[PDB]
C-alpha cells in the first residue's frame, strides 16, 4: 500500500506557505478531489511559547466569523501531537504576487479589491478583533479575483477601557506608534496597514521603504511619502488621511465609506446599514432552534432595528462643522466656562507618586494587587451594600516633566446600591487623601 498522508478524508500535498504560527499544506479529498488548506499547529511548539490562550481565542473567532472576504474555517482536527485547521482554499494565491506580475493594478480593479479588504476589516472591528498584520502577502485571491484576508495571528481581542502595546506586523506596514512601541487602540493600527495596501495596489511600490531599518522607521514617524503624478487628486487625499501620523487625526472606516473615490461602484451588500446588507446577511442575534426558509418574527427585529437606526439625532448627537435649535437648550451661566481633565496630575518623581498611593490606600483599608510597578488592582468592601468595589490604577507619562494617575472601574461581581456610584466614591476617597 501507498504511504499517503491522510487527515479527515483529505490527502495532504505541497506546502502553500509558512505563517506566523504553523505550516499550511494543500489537502485534496480522497474520493472527490475537493481542495482545502490545512494549517498544521504543533502542540509542543504552542506549549514552548505559552500561546495556548492565543490559539484558543484564534479558533473561537474563526468559528464565529462568516464573511465572504475572510478565509472560512471548516473544521479543526485534534491529534496527540498536532492541530489540523481545515480551511477554504483559494487558487489565486497572494495579492502581493498579483501586484508584482502586473507591476501596477488598474484604478477600477484596485478600488474593487480595496472595497472588499475594508469590508473584511470592518467585520473584524465590529466583532472586537484586530488582525494587526494586513499586507498584500496576507491578502489572498479566489478564481473570480475576490480578495480574502487570512493568517489571523499576531492579532488580539478589543476590550472596554483597555489598550494594546504588543508590536505586531512587518515594519513597512506597521503604524508609527507600533514602530515607537507605544500603547494604542485597535482600529487605527489596521487602517494604517490598509493605507499601505492601497498605495501598493495603485503604485506597485511601498510608501515607506529603505534598506537601513532606523531610516525606514524615521520615514514612518515623519509620514513623508511620494504621491505620483498618475494618481488622481481624489485618491491622493484618501491616502493622506489613512496614512496620517496622528492616530486621532487618522481616517476611520466611516470616513473612508463617506469618501467620494471609495463610494464609486461600491456594492450595496458589503457594509452594514446598506440597502442590500439586511437582505443578503444573516444577523448574529438569534432569538436556540434554527428555522430558515419557513414562515415565522426574525424580520420584525430587522425592521424595528432599521427604523431606530434611520432615526439619527434621536439616539446620537450630531457634532457641528440657519439651523433650528432645541426648545430645552439652556443658556450659559452668568460668561462662565469649565474644562474636564482625565486624572490627577503630578510633576514629582514616579516612585514619589506611587509611595503616596500605597500610603493613601492603607489608611483607607484598601486591598491591592501589584500587577506592575505602575499598575495596581485595588479593592474595597462597601459597608452598607456588603459588596466589593474593584478598580484599576495606572501611572502614565503626560510629558517629560508631567505625569498622570488613571482611574478605571472593574465591571465584575450592586442591586442594593449602584456600581457607577461605588466607583466614583472609591475614587473621591483616594483623590481627597492624596490632597
Amino acid at each position: 500500500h501507498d504511504g499517503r498522508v491522510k487527515i479527515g478524508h483529505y490527502v495532504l500535498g505541497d506546502t502553500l506557505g509558512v505563517g506566523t504560527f504553523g505550516k499550511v499544506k494543500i489537502g485534496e479529498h480522497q474520493l472527490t478531489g475537493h481542495k482545502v488548506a490545512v494549517k498544521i499547529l504543533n502542540r509542543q511548539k504552542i506549549r514552548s511559547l505559552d500561546v495556548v490562550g492565543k490559539i484558543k481565542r484564534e479558533i473561537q473567532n474563526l468559528k464565529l466569523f462568516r464573511h465572504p472576504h475572510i478565509i472560512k474555517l471548516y473544521q479543526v482536527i485534534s491529534t496527540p501531537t498536532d492541530f489540523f485547521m481545515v480551511m477554504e482554499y483559494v487558487s489565486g494565491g497572494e495579492l502581493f504576487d498579483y501586484i508584482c506580475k502586473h507591476g501596477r493594478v488598474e484604478e477600477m480593479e484596485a478600488r474593487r479589491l480595496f472595497q472588499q479588504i475594508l469590508s473584511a476589516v470592518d467585520y473584524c472591528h465590529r466583532h472586537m478583533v484586530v488582525h494587526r498584520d494586513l499586507k498584500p502577502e496576507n491578502v489572498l485571491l479566489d478564481a473570480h479575483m475576490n480578495a480574502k484576508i487570512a493568517d489571523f495571528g499576531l492579532s488580539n481581542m478589543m476590550s472596554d477601557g483597555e489598550f494594546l502595546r504588543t508590536s505586531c506586523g512587518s515594519p513597512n506596514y506597521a503604524a508609527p506608534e507600533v514602530i515607537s512601541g507605544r500603547l494604542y487602540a485597535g482600529p487605527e493600527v489596521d487602517i494604517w496597514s490598509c493605507g499601505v495596501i492601497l498605495y501598493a495596489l495603485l503604485c506597485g511600490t511601498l510608501p515607506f521603504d529603505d534598506e537601513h531599518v532606523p531610516t525606514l522607521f524615521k520615514k514612518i514617524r515623519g509620514g513623508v511619502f511620494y504621491i505620483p503624478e498618475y494618481l488622481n487628486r481624489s485618491v491622493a487625499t484618501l491616502l493622506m488621511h489613512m496614512l496620517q501620523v496622528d492616530p486621532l487625526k487618522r481616517a476611520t472606516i466611516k470616513d473612508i465609506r463617506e469618501h467620494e473615490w471609495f463610494k464609486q461602484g461600491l456594492p450595496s451588500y458589503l457594509f452594514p446599514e446598506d440597502p442590500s446588507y439586511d437582505a443578503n446577511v444573516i444577523d448574529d442575534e438569534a432569538v436556540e432552534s434554527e428555522v430558515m426558509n419557513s414562515l415565522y418574527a426574525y424580520h420584525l427585529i430587522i425592521d424595528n432595528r432599521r427604523i431606530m437606526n434611520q432615526a439619527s439625532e434621536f439616539y446620537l448627537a450630531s457634532s457641528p462643522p440657519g439651523l433650528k435649535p432645541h426648545p430645552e437648550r439652556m443658556p450659559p451661566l452668568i460668561v462662565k466656562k469649565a474644562k474636564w481633565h482625565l486624572g490627577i496630575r503630578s510633576q514629582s518623581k514616579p516612585y514619589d507618586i506611587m509611595a503616596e498611593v500605597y500610603r493613601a490606600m492603607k489608611q483607607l483599608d484598601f486591598e491591592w494587587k501589584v500587577v506592575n510597578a505602575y499598575h495596581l488592582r485595588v479593592r474595597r468592601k462597601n459597608p452598607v451594600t456588603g459588596n466589593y468595589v474593584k478598580m484599576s490604577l495606572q501611572l502614565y507619562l503626560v510629558d517629560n516633566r508631567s505625569y498622570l494617575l488613571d482611574f478605571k472601574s472593574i465591571d465584575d461581581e450592586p442591586r442594593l446600591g449602584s456600581h457607577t456610584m461605588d466607583f466614583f466614591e472609591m475614587c473621591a476617597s483616594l483623590i481627597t487623601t492624596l490632597a
Binding site: 504511504g3 502542540r43 490559539i55 491529534t79 496527540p80 494604542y184 439616539y315 439651523l323 466614583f424
Partner: protein, 184 residues
C-alpha cells in the same frame, strides 16, 4: 476514527516506523523536505515505537523513552481521550504549562532594573463632555464614545469644596456618561 501523527524530524534518505501496534514490523514513511511522516488510526493507551533510519535502529530524543530489560531503547506515546477534542486538548496544554496571588495591604518593593511609566495614549485625552453637540440635538445626547475611554474616570477642578466626577459606562449596546456632584 483516532488519528496519531508519527513525524521523523531527523535526517536520513530511508526511514521506517516499527512499533508494538505493527508487531515490530517496518512501515515505510513518505518524505516531503527532510520530514518522514505517517498518520495512523490508533486506540487509547500507551504505545511503544522506534525508527529504522538508513538501516540503523534509532529513537526521537524529543519524545518520552521506556528502556527494556535487555537495553532496548524505544519511544512511547500514550493516546488520550482528550487529544482528539481540540477544546479538551487545549484545556490540558494550559494546565501542563504550570506558569498572581491574594489581595494584600503590603506595598510593592522598587524594581531592581529602575524603568519609566508608559506614555499616555492620545485617545484618553478625547474628553466627551468638553465637546459641543449642536443646538438642534436634545442636550442630554452625546456622540458615540471610543471603547478605549470606557470605564475611565474624568474630573473637574474642585471649586468651593465640591468634587465633580464622570465616567462613560456601557449597558448592552448603549452608553451612559454619568456625572456626580459630591461635596468633599
Amino acid at each position: 476514527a483516532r488519528p496519531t501523527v508519527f513525524r521523523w524530524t531527523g535526517g536520513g534518505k530511508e526511514v521506517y516506523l516499527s512499533g508494538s501496534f505493527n508487531n515490530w514490523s517496518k512501515l515505510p514513511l513518505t518524505r516531503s523536505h527532510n520530514n518522514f511522516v505517517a498518520i495512523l488510526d490508533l486506540p487509547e493507551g500507551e504505545h511503544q515505537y522506534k525508527f529504522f533510519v538508513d538501516g540503523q535502529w534509532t529513537h526521537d530524543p524529543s519524545e518520552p523513552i521506556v528502556t527494556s530489560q535487555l537495553g532496548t531503547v524505544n519511544n512511547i506515546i500514550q493516546v488520550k481521550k482528550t487529544d482528539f477534542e481540540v477544546f479538551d486538548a487545549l484545556m490540558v496544554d494550559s494546565q501542563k504549562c504550570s506558569d498572581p496571588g491574594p489581595y494584600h495591604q503590603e506595598p510593592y518593593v522598587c524594581k531592581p532594573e529602575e524603568r519609566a511609566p508608559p506614555i499616555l495614549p492620545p485617545h484618553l485625552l478625547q474628553v466627551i463632555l468638553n465637546k459641543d453637540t449642536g443646538i438642534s440635538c436634545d442636550p442630554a445626547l452625546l456622540p458615540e464614545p471610543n471603547h478605549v475611554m470606557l470605564n475611565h474616570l474624568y474630573a473637574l477642578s474642585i471649586k468651593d469644596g465640591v468634587m465633580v466626577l464622570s465616567a462613560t459606562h456601557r449597558y448592552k449596546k448603549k452608553y451612559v456618561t454619568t456625572l456626580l456632584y459630591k461635596p468633599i
